[PDB]
Amino acid sequence: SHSVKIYDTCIGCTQCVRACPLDVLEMVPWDGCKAGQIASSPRTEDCVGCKRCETACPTDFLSIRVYLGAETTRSMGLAY
Numbered sequence: 792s793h794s795v796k797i798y799d800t801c802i803g804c805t806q807c808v809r810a811c812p813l814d815v816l817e818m819v820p821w822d823g824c825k826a827g828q829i830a831s832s833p834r835t836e837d838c839v840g841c842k843r844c845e846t847a848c849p850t851d852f853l854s855i856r857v858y859l860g861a862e863t864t865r866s867m868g869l870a871y
């Protein structure tokens with residue numbers, strides 16, 4: 792698992808929207824879900840790159856951006 796930006800990658804696995812004691816992967820405006828809302832991380836104001844998510848969808852999507860333990864230079868967690 793790598794990166795977890797705001798993507799409309801959701802099917803109904805529940806995963807990703809569970810492993811997060813900080814509550815990052817929240818509900819966003821989408822047009823595909825039963826409630827036209829995709830589980831993404833819009834307000835990542837709270838998240839110090841913890842080890843929980845590591846399950847952002849099957850990766851079938853997840854725009855090729857990479858982030859999780861990738862750069863951690865300016866977006867480490869606070870520096871951002």
Ligand code: SF4
Nearest residue numbers: 811838840841843844
């Ligand atoms: S690092 Fe932790 S708080 Fe941040 S997205 Fe992953 S599970 Fe949620």
Ligand code: SF4
Nearest residue numbers: 801802804805807848
């Ligand atoms: S891993 Fe991908 S399908 Fe599953 S709950 Fe998260 S967004 Fe939805």
